[PDB]
Design a binder for this molecule. Structure first.
Ligand SMILES: Cc1ccn(-c2nc(NC3CCC(F)(F)CC3)cc(N3CCOCC3)n2)n1
Ligand SMILES: [Ca+2]
Ligand SMILES: [Ca+2]
Ligand SMILES: [Ca+2]
Ligand SMILES: [Ca+2]
Ligand SMILES: [Ca+2]
Ligand SMILES: [Ca+2]
Ligand SMILES: [K+]
Ligand SMILES: [K+]
Lengths: 162, 144, 272, 54, 144, 144
């Protein structure tokens, strides 16, 4: 006699919150029927939520045809970056030599700054080349391995005639 | 074409054309396609390199590259898809379709037409009247 | 043949930004006005009129920009797919989507002074309450739907999908460069940043919405506190459950339901 | 009006034809992964072993 | 090196030297490499064994194995990354780089230099005054 | 017997015959199976194409297809599992079962039968005193 759990919207809210395992708030069943229904809804939700999560996680994957284009898109890059990183090393290895063996007066600050930039350029060049190996490794282990197997089997069967 | 669009397709010709030489051969195309996980056969590679080459030299060049990269980039060729729709029912492998099968498929498979309409389609389709439709000149005369 | 083209992509790119600016201006003004109206000045003062006429004007220019961006898209469709008359591109789906966009972008608090009656039952005590609310709160909240323009601008400004060679290669393989492809690529390359940004952006918006909704039936400063609502949203997101703070109105309950539904998948994705 | 209506229907037919030929390759891609790859390996190994004694 | 480091070095040498012989051959190296999951070919194995072989024998001994193990453990050997940076732009598999290409890459790829500086670099780098600029020199000269 | 069933049967027949020759050979039967992921061998394919054929032609006929399809769609022919139950104990591969083995398996395996029942058997099962009781006739006499 308080219009709390006998309200359709209140019951809807209670079922929704118990389905998601959040828990009750100020609304709890007064009878055993409501408790049994809540138990059934919770048991069903404990598997329904996991199944829905798995489905929505699988729906966000790229297909093989899209992968074959994304690989080309990524390989179009990772080469401009490599060239840009490799040119800086060649620039600094010349700047240091110029400033240390060409000028009449040796300015130490410029030499120190260029020697500091040289290590950064070297580290960037070394870092940019790991992505290429990672991309190659992940682009591998994707071949069918069956069409070539059948082709080789047919060739060996033909060669069996000697 | 913008000069940026020319530096593009050139940064890609550099990818396809390894070891310089300004030429793309079957081996280079096979290597770059296998680097992506694909495993084309010899016939497929030959067909791919034939669909682009126009010199007859057997090698692809940048002018032979820009004439296709500037067309497949945009638009939607209807003449490249009407032919696919035609050859869906051509399982033999030739370039001919029998008139009886054409009439049957037009009058029994999807949004069926009337007998008079398909009869008119056949009568303006069989120019030679020999009972064997080519469906290629039928595309050239109609689409164009 | 690159003459008429490349002269419409730039126009669309500019129109998207000019629409985004006026879209965010109205949101900033509504937040400022709704925060200031609760004590600084009454609804009958001239400040409310001055701060609402600006929102009306911004809405007018936003609609004007949208109804031109769509025309530019139609022109691009005509250029790409060989056609002469523009009625070829007008189908049911396009008209329905245009009408939906106009309806979504044409909501704002109209200048004036109107009130209605609001009743609710207090939680944990079951005591009725009755206050005279304002009509502007009903129309102010739906203005958050203008956030798809950010996604549109980000999609149009991407440096990956805009490359011509990539488009040609993808057309050779017969694939579509729609929004789903971009979302999948972003999830493939940077899966954590997207989740972090989405969660952080949702947190403050949900907390502010709950605070704005539950301020008419709260004379104890429990759920009408920014730090008292952010905590509630955080504990509801993680499925721990409510403590001594539960919504007194249906708006808070709906917001909590949406936050819980989003969290039930966000947590699993982050864990993976 | 008939020409415009039929051109719209032609575009719709084209776009619905291009969509149905992607499932035909998704099915093949997902079905090609069921090969055992061991029986054929053993058969080829036996054949090469027999060919060794030329 | 201390005695303990020699002990770990001998223990590690024992893994490659499986059946004895006091020597590591190509077969032993291939077996130990493939036991870890790697799949090197014959050319790669020969290159690996050549990078360490000293007395033109084809087999690796402990005196020639102790070396390079105290060098690939500390420092960075910048003379090993400068050559890689040069090889980045040398796609022909040779030991020379074109002067015009070198000027272009130094001018229009990353932290662009001035025309006078690159001109001075080209003039100083060309000892023989020829278009085929060597890069083993200019790395064995400046990095003294 | 209805026209609809004939329609689905013809549609299914169209799958196997890739060409329009109206024939199913060892090539199509096996190309389809490898398209479905199966990996049949030559002997298995030969047996499958053999045990549907009627007019000793090697190629499979549409009436031959219908005869097998109209029977392999309903009911469970007991004469197909009785022979399998006989083959369970026929490890050698011939068509004969020794009387002693049959008596032993009937007396010791399953629910077991008394000595009198198995004595009535054999003497009734075997139509001769050879001792090499055939199981192919004890299906066409007892269960026919
Ligand atoms: C991911 C990738 C990279 C290249 N791809 C590709 N290239 C093709 N043609 C090339 C165009 C440049 C060329 F002319 F220099 C050589 C031939 C054709 C082709 N395909 C596959 C899809 O449907 C059949 C044709 N794919 N795909
Ligand atoms: Ca080449
Ligand atoms: Ca050519
Ligand atoms: Ca040895
Ligand atoms: Ca040696
Ligand atoms: Ca056939
Ligand atoms: Ca036959
Ligand atoms: K809980
Ligand atoms: K959980």
């Amino acid at each position: 006699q308080q219009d709390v759990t006998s309200n359709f919207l209140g019951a809807m809210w209670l079922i929704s919150i118990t389905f998601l395992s959040i828990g009750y708030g100020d609304m709890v069943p007064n009878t055993y029927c409501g408790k049994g229904v809540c138990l059934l809804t919770g048991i069903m939700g404990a598997g329904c939520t996991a199944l829905v999560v798995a489905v929505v996680a699988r729906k966000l994957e790229l297909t093989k045809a899209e992968k074959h284009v994304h690989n080309f898109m990524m390989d179009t890059q990772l080469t401009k970056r490599v060239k840009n990183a490799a040119a800086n090393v060649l620039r600094e290895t010349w700047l240091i030599y110029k400033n240390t063996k060409l000028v009449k007066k040796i300015d130490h600050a410029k030499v120190r700054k260029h020697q500091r930039k040289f290590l950064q350029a070297i580290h960037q060049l070394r870092s940019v080349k790991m992505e290429q190996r990672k991309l190659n490794d992940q682009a591998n282990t994707l071949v069918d391995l069956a069409k070539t197997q059948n082709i080789m089997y047919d060739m060996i069967s033909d060669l069996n005639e000697r | 074409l913008t000069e940026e669009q020319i530096a593009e397709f050139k940064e890609a010709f550099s990818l396809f054309d390894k070891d310089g030489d300004g030429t793309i051969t079957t081996k280079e195309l096979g290597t770059v396609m296998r680097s992506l996980g694909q495993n084309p056969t010899e016939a497929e590679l030959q067909d791919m390199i034939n669909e682009v080459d126009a010199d007859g030299n057997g090698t692809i060049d940048f002018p032979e590259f820009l004439t296709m990269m500037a067309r497949k980039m945009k638009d939607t060729d209807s003449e490249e898809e009407i032919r696919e729709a035609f050859r869906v029912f051509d399982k033999d492998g030739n370039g001919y379709i029998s008139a009886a099968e054409l009439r049957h498929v037009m009058t029994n498979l999807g949004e069926k037409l009337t007998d008079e309409e398909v009869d008119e389609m056949i009568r303006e389709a069989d120019i030679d009247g020999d009972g064997q439709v080519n469906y290629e000149e039928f595309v050239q005369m109609m689409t164009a | 043949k690159l003459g008429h083209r490349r002269a419409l992509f730039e126009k669309r790119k500019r129109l998207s930004d000019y629409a985004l600016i006026f879209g965010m201006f109205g949101i900033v003004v509504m937040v400022i006005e709704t925060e200031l109206s609760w004590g600084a000045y009454d609804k009958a003062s001239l400040y409310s009129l001055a701060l609402k006429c600006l929102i009306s004007l911004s809405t007018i220019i936003l609609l004007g920009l949208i109804i031109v961006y769509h025309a530019r898209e139609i022109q691009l469709f005509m250029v790409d797919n060989g056609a002469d008359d523009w009625r070829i591109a007008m189908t049911y789906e396009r008209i329905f989507f245009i009408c939906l966009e106009i309806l979504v972008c044409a909501i704002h608090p109209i200048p004036g002074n109107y009130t209605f009656t609001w009743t609710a039952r207090l939680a944990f005590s079951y005591a009725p309450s009755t206050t005279t609310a304002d009509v502007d709160i009903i129309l102010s909240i739906p203005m958050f739907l203008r956030l798809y323009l950010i996604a549109r601008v980000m999609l149009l400004h991407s440096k990956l999908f805009t490359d011509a060679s990539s488009r040609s290669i993808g057309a050779l393989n017969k694939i579509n460069f729609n929004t789903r492809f971009v979302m999948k690529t972003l999830m493939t390359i940077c899966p954590g940043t997207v989740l972090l940004v989405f969660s952080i952006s949702l947190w403050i918006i949900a907390a502010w919405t709950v605070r704005a909704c539950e301020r008419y039936h709260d004379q104890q400063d429990v759920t009408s506190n920014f730090l008292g609502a952010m905590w509630l949203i955080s504990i509801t997101f993680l499925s721990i459950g409510y403590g001594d703070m539960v919504p007194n109105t249906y708006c808070g309950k709906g917001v909590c339901l949406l936050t819980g539904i989003m969290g039930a998948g966000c947590t699993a994705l982050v864990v993976a």
